Amino acid sequence: QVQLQESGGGLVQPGGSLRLSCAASGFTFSNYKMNWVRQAPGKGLEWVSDISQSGASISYTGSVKGRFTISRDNAKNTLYLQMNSLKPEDTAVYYCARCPAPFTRDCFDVTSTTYAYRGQGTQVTVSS
Amino acid sequence: KCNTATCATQRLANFLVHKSNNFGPILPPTNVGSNTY
Amino acid sequence: CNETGMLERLPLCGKAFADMMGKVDVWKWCNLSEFIVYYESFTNCTEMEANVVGCYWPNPLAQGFITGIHRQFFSNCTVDRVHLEDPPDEVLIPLIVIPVVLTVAMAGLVVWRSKRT
Amino acid sequence: SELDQLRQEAEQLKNQIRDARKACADATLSQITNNIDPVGRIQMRTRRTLRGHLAKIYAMHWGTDSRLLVSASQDGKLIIWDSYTTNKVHAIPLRSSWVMTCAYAPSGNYVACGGLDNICSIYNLKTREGNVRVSRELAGHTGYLSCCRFLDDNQIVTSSGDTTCALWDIETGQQTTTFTGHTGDVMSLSLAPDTRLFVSGACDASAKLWDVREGMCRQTFTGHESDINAICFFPNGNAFATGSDDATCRLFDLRADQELMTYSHDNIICGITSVSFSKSGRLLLAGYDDFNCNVWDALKADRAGVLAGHDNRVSCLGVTDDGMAVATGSWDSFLKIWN
Amino acid sequence: YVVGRKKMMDAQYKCYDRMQQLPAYQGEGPYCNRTWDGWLCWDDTPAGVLSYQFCPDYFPDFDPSEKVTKYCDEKGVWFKHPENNRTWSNYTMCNAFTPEKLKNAYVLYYLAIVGHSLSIFTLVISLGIFVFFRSLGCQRVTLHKNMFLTYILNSMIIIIHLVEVVPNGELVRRDPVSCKILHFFHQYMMACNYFWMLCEGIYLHTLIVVAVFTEKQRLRWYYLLGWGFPLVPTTIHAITRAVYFNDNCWLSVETHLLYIIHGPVMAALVVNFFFLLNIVRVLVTKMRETHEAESHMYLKAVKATMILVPLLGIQFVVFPWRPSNKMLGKIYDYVMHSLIHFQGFFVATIYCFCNNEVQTTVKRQWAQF
Amino acid sequence: SIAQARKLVEQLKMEANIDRIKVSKAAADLMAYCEAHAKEDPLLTPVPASENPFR
Amino acid sequence: DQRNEEKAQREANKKIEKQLQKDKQVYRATHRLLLLGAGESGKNTIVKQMTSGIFETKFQVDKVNFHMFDVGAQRDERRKWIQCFNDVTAIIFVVASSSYNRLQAALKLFDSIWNNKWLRDTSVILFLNKQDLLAEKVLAGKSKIEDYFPEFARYTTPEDATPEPGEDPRVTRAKYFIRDEFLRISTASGDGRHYCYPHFTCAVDTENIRRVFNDCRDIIQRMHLRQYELL
Ligand SMILES: *[C@@H]1O[C@H](CO)[C@@H](O)[C@H](O)[C@H]1NC(C)=O
Ligand SMILES: *[C@@H]1O[C@H](CO)[C@@H](O)[C@H](O)[C@H]1NC(C)=O
Ligand SMILES: *[C@@H]1O[C@H](CO)[C@@H](O)[C@H](O)[C@H]1NC(C)=O
Ligand SMILES: *[C@@H]1O[C@H](CO)[C@@H](O)[C@H](O)[C@H]1NC(C)=O
Secondary structure (H helix, E strand, O other): OOEEEEEOOEEEOOOOOEEEEEEEEOOOHHHOOEEEEEEOOOOOEEEEEEEOOOOOOEEEOHHHOOOEEEEEEOOOOEEEEEEOOOOHHHOEEEEEEEOOOOOOOOOOOOOOOOOOOEOOOEEEEEOO | OOOEHHHHHHHHHHHOOOOOOOOOOOOOOOOOOOOOO | OOHHHHHHHOHHHHHHHHHHOOOOOOOOOOOOOHHHOHHHHHHHHHHHOOOOOOOOOOOOOHHHHHHHHHHHHOOOOOOOOOOOOOOOHHHHOHHHHHHHHHHHHHHHHHHHHOOOO | OHHHHHHHHHHHHHHHHHHHHHHHOOOOHHHHOOOOOOOOOEOOOEEEEEOOOOOOEEEEEEOOOOOEEEEEEOOOEEEEEEOOOOEEEEEEEOOOOOEEEEEEOOOOOEEEEEEOOOEEEEEEOOOOOOOOOEEEEEEOOOOOEEEEEEEEOOEEEEEEOOOOEEEEEOOOOEEEEEEOOOOOOEEEEEEOOOOOEEEEEEOOOOEEEEEOOOOOEEEEEOOOOOOEEEEEEOOOOOEEEEEEOOOOEEEEEOOOOEEEEEEOOOOOOOOEEEEEEOOOOOEEEEEEOOOOEEEEEOOOOEEEEEEOOOOOOEEEEEEOOOOOOEEEEEOOOOEEEEO | OOHHHHHHHHHHHHHHHHHHHOOOOOOOOOOEOOEEOOOOEEOOEOOOEEEEEEOOOOOOOOOOOOEEEEEEEOOOEEOEOOOOOOEOOEOHHHHOOHHHHHHHHHHHHHHHHHHHHHHHHHHHHHHHHHHHOOOOOOHHHHHHHHHHHHHHHHHHHHHHHHHHHOOOHHHHHHOOHHHHHHHHHHHHHHHHHHHHHHHHHHHHHHHHHHOOOOOOOOOHHHHHHHHHOOHHHHHHHHHHHHHOOOOHHHOOOOOHHHHHHHHHHHHHHHHHHHHHHHHHHHHHHHHHHOOOOHHHHHHHHHHHHHHHHHHHOOHHHHOOEOOOOHHHHHHHHHHHHHHHHOHHHHHHHHHHHOOHHHHHHHHHOOOOO | OOOHHHHHHHHHHHOOOOOOOOHHHHHHHHHHHHHHOOOOOOOOOOOOOOOOOOO | OHHHHHHHHHHHHHHHHHHHHHHHHHHHHOEEEEEEEOOOOOHHHHHHOOOOOEEEEEEEEOOEEEEEEEEOOOOOOOOOHHHHHOOOOEEEEEEEOOOOOHHHHHHHHHHHHHOOHHHOOOEEEEEEEOHHHHHHHHHHOOOOHHHHOHHHOOOOOOOOOOOOOOOOHHHHHHHHHHHHHHHHHHOOOOOOOOOEEEEEOOOOOOOHHHHHHHHHHHHHHHHHHHHOOOO
């Protein structure tokens, strides 16, 4: 049973900091690429950041470079999104999304509306 | 003579047709001195 | 070497040849195969009798004698030799250029009609 | 929010089931078969090589007489072979070339096929005129057809990429029942021997048991890590095997409601595309993305044989009803019969 | 010892016939009258003129391909050698270089039997792999099949012609029809081998340049060009080799009738050279469009050319003529004989053994073989 | 949606109230099935070439 | 008897086999293309300028048959049905360049297509569509690409770039930056198996049917050069 449980989040001030954590269960964590995706209120799902199986290759969506840092602890089966200098447009539900197949370079459908290997999410609110 | 590269095999066979078989050199050079024809 | 000394002793070679060729069929005087040994000892005679005086063989006088024998016995049969001569260029050139144009006309016809354009 | 009241309650229902199955798991299949003797080395040779397909083969199905079989290739062709004489019996041209499944009716009078057209087409094999034409076109799936299986001349079950399964009345062309439990694309279905149940595996890494005549999901099975690509029933209908993209096969039991065995290896890092049991269920044959088929000892989880002939991805494999032969389709456009 | 002395007396007999049948010299200037010098039948020559004649084949040392010279001195007298004052003809070129030419020729001789045997060995193995696997099968392999078959049959007839005809000098004197028939199959299979090189170049050129989108051409035209058309120059040659230059076993290379075959054969390899240039031109354009490193672009364009010269026969276009120099001829012999006799071995290694689709197929289907 | 979670809970209740036998009993039936049909499995033990239709 | 059946079956097999040879010539002559793209990318406009689960378009360029397939009634999860198109000549990927975040989503889909195990030998004809809409967004200057793509600040137009006549260098710099974002994915795993052919297109360009033909000719040429180990 593939389960992803996102923690962290809540209310925070512009320029604040929030560390999102994703506990994984039901699969070999190290064999899989991991992603972060978010859904702003009234908008579709958007890819935020991913990190390779070992943690060497890392990518970000341009609007969070220099602010968000993704990392993984394979021994602890946890995905992390350290969010520095938050902005009010960073308010959304954040989903920890797994890649569908292991040992693959492609990563399909992680932002689909009904993707299966995705957590329920955590809310992040940046307001005055 | 046929000097092209595609005639090289025929030139070798035509050369060796009567010279010697199994290269047995029991023949001294033919006397082509001044005391001959 | 005495050139006249050999002239008197030369007929001895022609005599023995006219006797060895007197026991052969007179009609069969163009079959070089049979008298290839009799026409060889005669040349051997005219040669080894030309050095006994000291003259080198051949000679202008000795080959006059061997011509007097050839003009006596081998006048009734002419001998045919394989020519082994290339044809003249007026026919040799078309024998080469025509197959060459056919080579490029066939290599061009293949590119044209292989895929039916 | 009441949406969290229902999302935290279902968590407790998942914990109750996890412990209800935990109590039933008193022993494992491996230790109960720790004393049975292995089958040994299984060496199968290619007896027939069915040529004629132009593109990759996606599906094949044996007839009930264990001699005739139909194969579907993505060049838009259904070919019915005589596996004995390698003679083709029919060559049915398809309307849509993106076929992903085919089926042989138990009577042998109809074949079915479908794919990216979202349609299950039924063909009449035995017409009075003597031709093979379309008898029915079953429309109603909003996603691609992944698998189809005849119950009889008038009933067929289909699985679709639209996450649902459906039962069809062929004569009227209407969905009698619909099975809407899965959340990902349903990739394969397998009918129980009594044709009163069927299991389906989907891209949500789960399998579900369905009641045909009632239309409900009786049991839901988990354990795989990625999409389930293949599924097949054990000969007695009390178990089934699934093959997934996580590079493993697993065996499930209906009455124990949990996975009994996992067929895997450290050198296998490719997904399973097709599964099938032998006649007695002792052998579990599985096709793989690495062009090979692995023969598994289904009781001891040991690999006993390998079919290595295929040049490309093995798409499908079926075992005859009399257990005499195994067929394998592949992306290299060839079907091989192995005995 | 005996064979030469009887064929020497044949020339002497024909000499005293030619001296009698031919008329007097109807020209001005004191002419040295015709003479039989003991080995050759020298004819009338104007004063101060040097006469040439092919060396007589009476002795193993004498190379008939050489020239004999007899100087007709002024006032109609033949050149007398100063050391002895005896009338003399220059037979010095006959056996001057013969010990050196004969030694080099035995290395070229045993390079042919070893190069053609290694060709047959690897080409029969290459042909079996192609025939056994329908998986490797395609229109390219089908054309490679016929190309490999020409290399096998051409190398077969050469070893038969080099082990049976060449060392047997007694059979050449008998001049049977059998050796002229073996020569016909040698000139036919030689042109089939060169014309299938043109068939490989036509197919490769059509595949890359002329018509890319179509991949199914009819091969009846490649069969007619590689197997059927070399019947035209080989029969025109044999008809004229029988009418004009009908030597013993058709072993002579002094006739210009040999360009009835090697003329069209050179025209087929020149066309192949213009296919190679157009293919490399297309290849470097593909690398410039993907912005290949200029250094790495030269290693790819050199390697592509080097693997296309054995298949298309480019060594016959870039070394067409043999240098008359003594040193530049000895090196041309060792290089061109290596490239000719081992060409079938190179094509089998490049296009079958080093081929990636073959190496993958052979390794995977090793169990069923 | 919030209405979808109502049927997911109801389906988890129909699947929780089922009778599950022990795995030892379930594993025994699969083994005992293969022993009872081991002879009828041609791929398990090769048949003679006089009865194999794919000879 | 049994012998009569083998005769009649042998007749049926040969009749089917002659039909299959005819099918082989028709199948091997047509070139199949997959058309992919978002809903607002403009691919539906390129279709008409040249519910069933899949749609077909058969057009001809220089007497060459092309069969273009457009996915219709399928879900946004593509990881299963996209494997059917592993044997197409090329995948035509349409991107809306003026959608800078649909653009990052299109970049992500291109990356997973490019690195898919079964699509590794399939070339991608990349249509950077809506170039006229991108000009209006940069000429106005209301939205900076530097916001969604901060690397646009340090980006300069390459020298090999060939700007159209009458083009503001800000537009030339913008559209060539987007092209390089895709080419950075393409040139990281090319390896000679497949190649990406990017084109700046508009949804109504009559030259789009010719770009596919010229790219497909280049793809087939590189396939033939690969069979001879030349390239
Ligand atoms: C040549 O020999 C004859 C024979 O007796 C002799 O009379 C003559 O003097 C000789 N000639 C010379 C120059 O000695
Ligand atoms: C010429 O005749 C003599 C007579 O004794 C003989 O010794 C010699 O060998 C002969 N020469 C030839 C070439 O026959
Ligand atoms: C041939 O020419 C030579 C010139 O040295 C002369 O001595 C001889 O008498 C001539 N013979 C005839 C038959 O003209
Ligand atoms: C004969 O030919 C040789 C060359 O083979 C040359 O050196 C010589 O001067 C010529 N003449 C004589 C009288 O040897």
